[PDB]
Design a protein around this ligand. Sequence first.
Ligand code: A1BF0
Ligand code: A1BF0
Lengths: 265, 262
Amino acid sequence: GSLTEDGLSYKEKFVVRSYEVGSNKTATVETIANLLQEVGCNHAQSVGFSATTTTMRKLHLIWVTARMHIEIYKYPAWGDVVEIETWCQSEGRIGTRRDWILKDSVTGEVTGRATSKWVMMNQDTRRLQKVSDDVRDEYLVFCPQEPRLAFPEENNRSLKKIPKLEDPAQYSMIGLKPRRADLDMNQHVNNVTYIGWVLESIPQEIVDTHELQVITLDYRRECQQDDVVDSLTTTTSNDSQFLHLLRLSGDGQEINRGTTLWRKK
Amino acid sequence: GSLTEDGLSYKEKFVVRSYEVGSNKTATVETIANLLQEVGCNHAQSVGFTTTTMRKLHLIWVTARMHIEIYKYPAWGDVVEIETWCQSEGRIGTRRDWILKDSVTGEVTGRATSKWVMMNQDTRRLQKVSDDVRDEYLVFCPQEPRLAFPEENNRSLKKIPKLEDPAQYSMIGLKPRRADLDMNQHVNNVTYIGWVLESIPQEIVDTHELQVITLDYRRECQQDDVVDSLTTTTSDSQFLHLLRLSGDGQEINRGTTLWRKK
Ligand SMILES: CCC(=O)N1CCC[C@@H](NS(C)(=O)=O)C1
Ligand SMILES: CCC(=O)N1CCC[C@@H](NS(C)(=O)=O)C1
């Protein structure tokens, strides 16, 4: 991979691997979400980040995900090359936004697209805070000045409010605990694992007869290595829509809430 | 990746990814085990293969044993070149070996070996392969032996005992998710390595590096099954492992790990 000519976005090509595909012999949405994380990490590395600045490291501040939104038109098959282009943009003092465009390396067509909202937070106290001016100036030079949105549409599904699932849930998957493969280099549960846990309560029949088109997922609380998650799903509907809820199997503390959209194969 | 000049082995280079490394910023043993599966898949695809003729008789190649020895784990961003090849183990089964190297220095940073047996996909009955099938794949194997672990009296061929109750350490209630399944909906052989290492104490992981792992495969775990992971120290640090069904206690896996101080 490498930064584009203007140095305001990053491109990388990925060959789809054998262990990365599902029952349809195409890449899973978790493989796609992993590739977005990977291309986003290399974009930060290419412009000197580790994605903390010198002021963020000084004040013990980190970037955390608040929302993830992914919309797939075609899942790359095993062996196919997929080119992902990523870039960042400031959302004022709310935080940053990172967008992605997935393309076919042979045809050049857009086969998917993603967007995510990141927030500023003290790494120790877990207290969210607004982006200060001194931090904002350190990264604004790596972002396009004119808006560049992957989801620009007047009424897009990436900005809608997600409601809280009411008990009893139509479907559920109970007793989900993360393993060392679910943790990252800093021992925190990878954001991709939550997508896998959300989709564990989707019935097998829906998976076997439908393809996942959209997934919007709001991140409320981080799950610890020693925590246990409960995954809840309810149908809210040609197409199939679902409401999702991840919560601690004990107290019932909410960690995630989301929505999925599926279409007939 | 591509087949070597003689077409009797396959080479492929992999760049280590951000989500593939552990706490020490080097690739995990499960990432390594995934890369071996990937390079082995592409070697079969490069010579047209899953296998041939045995498709009508309903026969599949299944793992009986996996043995991996790592000297250095590639860091995040480092390129690692893996060379794989197959060989006939008479009529007991087939064997696949791997050599992991540093793309910059060219030194061997790890090596693996595995024994594959052949069974009916439906009845799951282990059986030796016919001479008609033991000829269709020999043209893709070196005729003279080429072993990754040649040493007389080595770790890859030793008998693994069964762990006695009570186990020193355990991790219970381990269920596979859709990410743990492959294209055919079976739990991929790499997940068992992750489950085996779940009963290793966190202190051992934080203060040691995994040097060797020998794992014998006895029974496949279904999507709706629950696994119990058991571990006992048998001593560097050596361990005895046992995966079994949460209910009846049916053995699915048994193994041994060896760890060195960082
Ligand atoms: C290429 C890296 C970059 O421009 N940035 C911009 C500011 C946020 C960081 N990115 S993030 C955590 O994905 O929002 C670093
Ligand atoms: C390049 C492919 C190849 O040589 N073979 C030989 C027979 C066993 C198969 N390999 S396997 C399943 O990994 O044991 C396919």
